[PDB]
Amino acid sequence: IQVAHSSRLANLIDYKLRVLTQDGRVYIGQLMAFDKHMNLVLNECIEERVPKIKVEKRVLGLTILRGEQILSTVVEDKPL
Amino acid sequence: SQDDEYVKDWLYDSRPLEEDSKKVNGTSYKKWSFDLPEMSNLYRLSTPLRDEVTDKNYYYLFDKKSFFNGKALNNAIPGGPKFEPLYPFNSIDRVIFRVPIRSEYKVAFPHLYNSRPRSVRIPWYNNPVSCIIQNDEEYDTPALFFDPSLEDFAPLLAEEEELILPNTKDAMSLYHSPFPFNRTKGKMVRAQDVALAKKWFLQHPDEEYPVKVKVSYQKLLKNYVLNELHPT
Amino acid sequence: EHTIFTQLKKNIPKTRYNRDYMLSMANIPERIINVGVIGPLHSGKTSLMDLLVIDSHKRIPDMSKNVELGWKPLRYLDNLKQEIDRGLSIKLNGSTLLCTDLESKSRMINFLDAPGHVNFMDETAVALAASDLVLIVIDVVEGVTFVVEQLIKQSIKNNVAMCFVINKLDRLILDLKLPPMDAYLKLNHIIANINSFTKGNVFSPIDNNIIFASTKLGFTFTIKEFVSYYYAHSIPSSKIDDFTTRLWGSVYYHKGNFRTKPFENVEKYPTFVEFILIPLYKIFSYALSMEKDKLKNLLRSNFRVNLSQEALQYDPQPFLKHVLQLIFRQQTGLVDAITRCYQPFELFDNKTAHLSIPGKSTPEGTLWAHVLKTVDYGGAEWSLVRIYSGLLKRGDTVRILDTSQSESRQKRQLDETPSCEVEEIGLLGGRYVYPVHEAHKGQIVLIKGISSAYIKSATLYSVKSKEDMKQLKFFKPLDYITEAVFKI
Amino acid sequence: RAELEELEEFEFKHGPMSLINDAMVTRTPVIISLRNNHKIIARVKAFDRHCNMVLENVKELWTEKKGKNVINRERFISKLFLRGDSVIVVLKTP
Amino acid sequence: NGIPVKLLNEAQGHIVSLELTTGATYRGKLVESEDSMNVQLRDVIATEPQGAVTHMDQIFVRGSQIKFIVVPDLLKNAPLFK
Amino acid sequence: PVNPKPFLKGLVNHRVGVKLKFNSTEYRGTLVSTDNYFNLQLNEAEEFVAGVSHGTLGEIFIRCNNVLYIRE
Amino acid sequence: GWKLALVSKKTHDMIWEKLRYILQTQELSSTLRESLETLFEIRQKDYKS
Amino acid sequence: MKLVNFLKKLRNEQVTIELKNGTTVWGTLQSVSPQMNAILTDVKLTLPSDNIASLQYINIRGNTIRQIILPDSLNLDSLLVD
Amino acid sequence: VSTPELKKYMDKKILLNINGSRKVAGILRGYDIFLNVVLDDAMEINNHQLGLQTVIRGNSIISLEALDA
Amino acid sequence: MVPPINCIFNFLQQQTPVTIWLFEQIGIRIKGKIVGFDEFMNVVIDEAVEIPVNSKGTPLGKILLKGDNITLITS
Ligand SMILES: Nc1nc2c(ncn2[C@@H]2O[C@H](COP(=O)(O)OP(=O)(O)OP(=O)(O)O)[C@@H](O)[C@H]2O)c(=O)[nH]1
DSSP: OOOOOOSSSGGGTTSEEEEEETTSOEEEEEEEEOOTTOOEEEEEEEEEOOOOOOOOOEEEEEEEEOSTTEEEEEEEEOOO | OOTTTTGGGTSSOSSTTSSOTTTBSOSSOOEEOOOHHHHHHHHHHTTTTSOOOOOGGGSTTOSHHHHHHHHHHTOOOTTSOOOOOSOOOOOTTTOOOSSOOOHHHHHHSHHHHSSSOOSOOOOOOOOOOOOOOOOSSOOSOOOSSOOOOOOOOOOSSOSOOOSSOTTHHHHHHHHHSOTTTSOSOEEOOOTTTOOTTHHHHHSOOOSOOOHHHHHHHHHHHHHHHHHHHSOO | OOSSOOOOSSOOOOBSSOHHHHHHHTTSSSSEEEOOOBOSTTOSHHHHHHHHHHHHBSOOSSOOHHHHHTSSOOOTTOOSHHHHHHTSOOSOOOEEEEEEOSSSOEEEEEEOOOOOSSSTHHHHHHHHHHOSEEOBEEETTTBSOHHHHHHHHHHHHTTOEEOOEEEOHHIIIIISOOOHHHHHHHHHHHHHHHHHHOSSSOOOTTTTOOEEEETTTTEEEOHHHHHHHHSSSSSOSTTHHHHHHHHSSSOBOTTSSSOBSSOOSSOOSOHHIIIIIHHHHHHHHHHHHSOHHHHHHHIIIIIOOOOOHHHHTSOHHHHHHHHHHHHSOSSOHHHHHHHHHTOOOTHHHHHHHHHSOSOOOGGGSOEEEEEEEEEOSSSSOEEEEEEEESEEETTOEEEEEETTSSHHHHHHHOOOOOOEEOOOEEEEBSSOEEEOSEEETTEEEEESSSGGGOSSSEEEEEOSOHHHHHHOOOOOOOOOSSOOOOOO | OHHHHHHHHHHHHHSTTHHHHHHHHHTOEEEEEETTSOEEEEEEOOOOTTOOEEEEEEEEEEEOOOSSOOOEEEEEEEEEEEOTTTEEEEEEOO | OOHHHHHHHHTTTSEEEEEETTOOEEEEEEEEOOSSOOOEEEEEEEEOTTSOEEEOSEEEEOGGGEEEEEOOSSTTTSSSOO | OOOHHHHHHHHTTSEEEEEESSSOOBOOEEEOOOOTTOOEEEEEEEEETTSSEEEEEEEEEEOSTTEEEEEO | OHHHHHSOHHHHHHHHHHHHHHHHSSOOOHHHHHHHHHHHHHHHHTOOO | OOHHHHHHHOOSOEEEEEESSOOEEEEEEEEEOTTOOEEEEEEEEEOOOOOEEEOSEEEEOTTTEEEEEOOSSOOHHHHHOO | OOOOOOTTTTTSBEEEEETTTEEEOOBEEEOOTTOOEEEEOOEEOOOEEOOSEEEEOSTTEEEEEESOO | OOOHHHHHHHHHHHOOOEEEEBTTOSSEEEEEEEOOOOSSSOEEEETOOEEEOOOOOBOOOOEEEOGGGBOOOOO
């Protein structure tokens, strides 16, 4: 995996981002919009739960992720 | 060198501005772009020849369209031109001559009051103009009319105490002016191409000139309409 | 080719947003406002419409150089040869515009720039019948004359939401050259008049009912809009509402950081004057008189506005217009005013009842629509139809009833004999019929095949059951407010 | 902003925020119970409104308990930042 | 103002899905939204965390409980972004 | 008239018993002072683990967010 | 009034200003209001008679 | 009075971190937000008896951050004063 | 400041989902900005009523469902 | 219409049989009568009683309970 040594989150917007969630799932997709409260809008969001064995996988598309239920953000891949 | 403080130096030149590289295009002398106050000066100076009629309504049943209509029906508006005719039920028993149906109407609503119209244009129709002009030595005042019955921050454009600048009294006037002075930039035209005289006879004849002068006016309008009418 | 003109082409001027999105939005009601802008002769309503359209679209062909500059008004919604040459809006040449509100939301509006001249009020009546909100528009100068009052009465009697536009401020600032307090007073007088006429709801800049426009210079604002733009930096998030409420309605800032309701010792003017009107005055006064560099600096500082280097070399009117555009970013505040005003959709019932009859079992899924008026919008015969329930698809058969046969039909009910196809559908957009297959509920579209099925102002329907048909009702003939008594 | 910080330090000295402020002034080791069960013996360096507190001389005490094998575990850290919400009860050891 | 909350309120009317902290998904027409995501729906299927579906006419939700909201592919187009 | 905050101001310099939510325990010590946040401080606070004094903690400072109820 | 305009114009203007200020921002008597209105109407011509 | 001042003043330091669940995080302090959001480049994670999961870049939510183990060469009193 | 528009649901029975899978039936009496539901108490989840008039806290609300249309 | 502030002002003056449920808590309830009210939802309760849930009358007195962890009230 490769990414630029970025200063802040908004500078790397529209990047394929692995986004953890407090309930155990991880949402992977290119981020369109962020917030002061860390609400995120993934362009091609993909629902990936970790069941109690192997990864659960599901496609969502354009979705809002609420900020409170986020654990953290990670860059998965580049734009385009 | 006080009222006419800017133009005075150059108003009488062969080419008004040979250099003045900011104010004109250059020495080719193709385009120009004056600042405000000099434009104001020009306007003031032009008081004798300037169009001097802001109320666009004024040319009512006196536009080129109106003239054309008059032509097309032989319903000459008496202040204006009268042409060679364009061409070579309804009984007294029937109709009721309550309104004596005038020629002025026959061009106003040409398709309605004038039956059997041919080659007839449609004129304008308009809103009432209340451009109140100021006389002198003041600004922003109701004069000609009556009045109605009844966390540490300042508002916008703070530290701009004077509402009106010394030029805005004149700028407003300029803004209301017609096409010559209206604007603060233009392309040149040939002295030839400027019509200092058209604006007098296109607008209405002032007051009680001798018949001959009235005739002259009419003649001029007849020419003008013809020129307008056969686009070359 | 033809003289009495529209677009008649594949390449309709491209929009900033995309029309696919607009049509998608138009799938659901509660997101299609039918505005039907109204007012006296030369209110500026058509000019307002033009402003909106221009704001919406990228580059129009008809938007020539001069109109762009702002010498001539781009009267985009007087498509008829006559309506140009005559200088009057004469028929309904509305537009479908995906309009952004001040708060972030995207609603497709069906505007209808109706005529103002009082002989044409017939045409206007249709707009009232059509539209669920009405942007009444008023000239400041003439104020509310009788015509405006009449219009208001009609709207209230026709059960339609109202959201006023006090238009042509440029006149009172430049033509009349009123002092700012005087201007404020005038405004108060006007709004007072409005309130007097409208016995029910009380209109004001607060609550975002009134809209302060100048379509020649090309700017509208609600106070909410303006405040949002230029009094969000200064004052905090929560106290903004209070500020908004204060601005208008005789409260004086008092040189101090929390105003008094009564008189103040130091300054003279109200908050509305000090915090809006005075700024406008400053703009106008400076956008003519002020040495351009200084003006540029001020714009940079206070408004956060960058003048184009071309705009520096504009003529003083068009320059001013450009500046105004830069200041009041869009016709967004106006849209906010509309949406906020027409947040009641319980009025829909009242409207429908008023038009046809008080009834129910209408949302069974039977498509039915008020055929408003036959128009000649692309030259050809079109029928402007407002759909209420269901959705109409292209190449569908439909029952149609001329509202001559409406009362009679009603009487007879307490055998769908007339019928016709729908050859094509499209959307009015000032100068083009933009073709669309869908024609969803709660909106206005143009259809080919209806026209010849009726004379004026029909209803349509397409029941899937005789029982359903029994449950139906039919619109009354549109009582065109003016009676025609000029016999030729 | 300055008047709020003045009443902050004023309200600390008089209110119960004075205790661990005085513990920082005396600079003693203090035990702190935690949300995920960690008795933190440490020297308090920093102190704010929210009870976020940088800790010198850190010594966390807990029990990683799984497999019927009580393994009371503990570690030393040089310096550590504490978040407020984790704290349950701070106490100054005599 | 929150540009994701901007999107939510712009998404009103479409068939949107919604899972909470509880893990119980929903799906139907949205009706209302605010700064705090005080969501309302119509025609909403209400699948419990086990998978037990219960169709119902309407629902109102509090924003604190919301986890994520499935928006359609239309809001990808326009007009909130640019 | 007997509100919480004035009774709490009367409860200053008096014995109090603190109960909490998760991984929690009753207490018993003389309240020292309070604020608008309801951050507590006790002297001679005894750690009553479900009403059983596990240890005399003494001079302590309890956080506001984990407070459930406070009694005599 | 016309005479006032003629020579002592500043005061006349001032008088107008005060009058208007009174006119609209006041709990003013109705007959008085009508008189004022009449005054302004005549002002529009500035005493023809 | 704000430790946010100090945490803002902590820049380009390689630090360990704990979370609400208790996950370790070894990475350079790229920046810290006024609400504790630890922007970190060149990061390495290890869960709470579990094996390594190293990564390129992680900005973690402020509230999820439990306890940041600071580096060795660190004068606390130098940054605390203005 | 944004008032949750419960005037559509005012004076109607509502199935309030609250913390720990608990349900509350009851006709609505009023509310506030925090969503604290003032409601006439009804049977709590076979089924049994506690109280006559109740006020539920907003933080404890999971959801509130339209029982009445 | 009755906001929670006004309904609790009825509970304040009345002091009628209140039953309280608790936040993040199913195992225990309370039974008393409302005596206080804060600007927050903090309320002091006299004659309060700890009442474990019907899956007895256990001892409890007068309590200032931190009101941010409330669920039910009903006087
Ligand atoms: N001074 C000034 N004039 C304006 C303004 N807006 C419009 N006008 C003028 O008045 C006319 C009113 O606008 P239009 O759109 O042309 O008229 P309209 O609204 O179509 O009137 P109807 O045909 O009755 O609908 C324009 O033709 C302009 O010349 C303004 O803001 N200031």
